[PDB]
């Protein structure tokens, strides 16, 4: 019943090849709805979902203003971080940010986020109390006390607890048909002998939304991790997701293995058996 909105940004410096590239995307749950790319020609926030196209021209102007501002802010932050770590302007580096909010089934505020990573690793993150910071190293401790003195956390609360949850609420209403549906997984199993002694059994889940799902193999009713392989959940490209789980079994003992599939859209966990 709960829902999330996230914005992800990536700034990458390209020394000797122009200003840093900035890419930002926005998501409601597992559904992208906007994008901005500093290298694209339009220089605008662009829709990536049908239900956000309802938004009028003032929305697109304003959201474009906000993301371009972020792009200039994080170009500066790349240079500051270069100074904090004492690195040369010769190398390429990455600043990623994520912010957004969670709401419960009744739409009320659950949690807010506002976090940075530098070169792939935690830098500074707003804590769940929306009052304090977790800094990952001595570089980020510089920023932590700057932001404590300037009360940057307090100045973010109106957005996280107000604009974010209000926007998320509006999007969930505008896109009910897309965002508030559950698509249950379509499941099947495949079977391949790999020698005269063993066989692969593969349990499939297809066409499910949201992406959250659990596939587990049991042997004689007990969980089985030995000789199992679970791939990352992947996008079909049409808005739904796919996953599989495989196990190598002794030839002739296929019937003692069961694959168990749990998903929001299933009123009962599924049990598959060859």
């Amino acid at each position: 019943g709960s829902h999330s909105m996230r914005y992800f940004s990536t700034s990458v410096s390209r020394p000797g090849r122009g200003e840093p590239r900035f890419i930002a995307v926005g998501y409601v749950d597992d559904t992208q709805f906007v994008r901005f790319d500093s290298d694209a020609a339009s220089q605008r926030m662009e829709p990536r979902a049908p239900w956000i196209e309802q938004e009028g021209p003032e929305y697109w102007d304003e959201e474009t203003g906000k993301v371009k501002a972020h792009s200039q802010t994080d170009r500066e932050n790349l240079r500051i971080a270069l100074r904090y770590y004492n690195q040369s302007e010769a190398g390429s580096h990455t600043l990623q940010m994520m912010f957004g909010c969670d709401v419960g089934s009744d739409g009320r505020f659950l949690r807010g986020y506002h976090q940075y990573a530098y070169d792939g690793k935690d830098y500074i993150a707003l804590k769940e109390d929306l009052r304090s910071w977790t800094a990952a190293d001595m570089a980020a401790q510089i920023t932590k006390r700057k932001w404590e003195a300037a009360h940057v956390a307090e100045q973010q609360r109106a957005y996280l607890e107000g604009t974010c949850v209000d926007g998320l609420r509006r999007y969930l209403e505008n896109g009910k048909e897309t965002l508030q549906r559950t698509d249950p997984p379509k499941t099947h199993m495949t079977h391949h002998p790999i020698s005269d002694h063993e066989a692969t059994l593969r349990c499939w889940a297809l066409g499910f939304y949201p992406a959250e799902i659990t596939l587990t193999w049991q042997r004689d009713g007990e969980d089985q991790t030995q000789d199992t392989e679970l791939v990352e959940t992947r996008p079909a490209g049409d808005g739904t997701f796919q996953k599989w789980a495989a196990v190598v079994v002794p030839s002739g003992e296929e019937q003692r293995y069961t694959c168990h599939v749990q998903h929001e859209g299933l009123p009962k966990p599924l049990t598959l058996r060859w």
Binding site: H70, T73, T143
Partner: peptide, 9 residues
């Protein structure tokens, strides 16, 4: 809705 982000590190 995006946030207004001007804060430097």
């Amino acid at each position: 809705n995006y946030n207004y982000l001007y804060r430097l590190l």
